[PDB]
């Protein structure tokens, strides 16, 4: 579990969104596994606006932050799970690292701010849903 709190927005994995998230919906995209809802309180996270390929992510199943090298956001095939059929997930970045069910929502960050959140795992790979292209998170 986990979310990004930027401005008056809450960014979560779409597959983990709550009823309150759907009832206060700003934007959602199943192909990216992202959903954004509105918040009453202002958050403290800031979004990175860059093309970094190195950063640090939080792994809840290890209680540890790990430094990683990650691929550029792209269209990647993700196997069938209990949340989605086998499909191409867009804006996904992969790295070598531990990720098991429960780790979605952990933040990946670089020197510029939050880059994205954990969205996939297994086989010694961790995948992150990028948010750096969502420029509207910084305003309104």
Ligand X SMILES: NC(=O)[C@H]1CCCN(C(=O)NCC2CC2)C1
Active site residues: 15, 33, 104
Of the ranges 15-23, 36-44, 73-81, 111-119, which one interacts with Zn ion (CB under 5 A)? 111-119
Residue 112: which of ligand X, Zn ion, none does it interact with, CB under 5 to 8 A by kind? Zn ion
| Contacting residue, 33, 70, 109, 132, with ligand X by CB under 6 A | 33
Nearest Cα to 69, choosing from 35, 45, 93, 103? 93
Residue 23 CB contacts under 8 Å (≥ 6 apart), including other chains: none
Site string (110-139) toward ligand X, x via CB under 6 A: --------xxxxx-----------------
Stretch that binds ligand X, among 45-53, 65-73, 78-86, 132-140 (CB under 6 A): 78-86
Residue 68 interacts with ligand X (CB under 6 A): yes or no: no
Please report the beta strands in 2-121, taking only residues with DSSP state E, as ranges in sequence order. 4-13, 25-29, 34-44, 54-59, 64-69, 74-78, 87-96, 107-110, 113-120
Ranges within 3-22 binding ligand X (CB under 6 A): 15
Q: How far is the CB of 48 from Zn ion (least distance, A)?
A: 4
The count of other CB atoms within 10 Å of the CB of residue 24 is: 14
Beta strand 64-69 pairing with 54-59: antiparallel
Least distance to ligand X from the beta carbon of 32, Å?
A: 9
d(CA 28, CA 12): 10
- H or E element that contains 19: helix 19-23
Residue 78 makes contact with ligand X by CB under 6 A: yes
Cβ-proximal residue to Zn ion, closest one: 52
């Amino acid at each position: 579990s986990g979310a990004i709190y930027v401005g008056n927005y809450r960014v979560v994995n779409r597959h983990l969104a709550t009823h309150n998230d759907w009832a206060n919906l700003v934007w959602e995209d199943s192909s990216r596994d992202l959903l954004v809802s509105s918040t009453t309180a202002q958050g403290c996270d800031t979004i990175a606006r860059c093309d970094c390929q190195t950063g640090v992510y939080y792994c809840s199943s290890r209680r540890k932050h790990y430094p990683v090298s990650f691929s550029k956001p792209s269209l990647i095939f993700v196997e069938a799970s209990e949340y989605y059929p086998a499909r191409y997930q867009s804006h996904l970045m992969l790295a070598v690292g531990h990720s098991e069910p429960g780790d979605c929502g952990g933040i990946l960050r670089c020197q510029h701010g939050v880059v994205g959140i954990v969205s996939t795992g297994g086989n010694g790979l961790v995948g992150f849903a990028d948010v750096r292209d969502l420029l509207w998170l910084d305003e309104e």
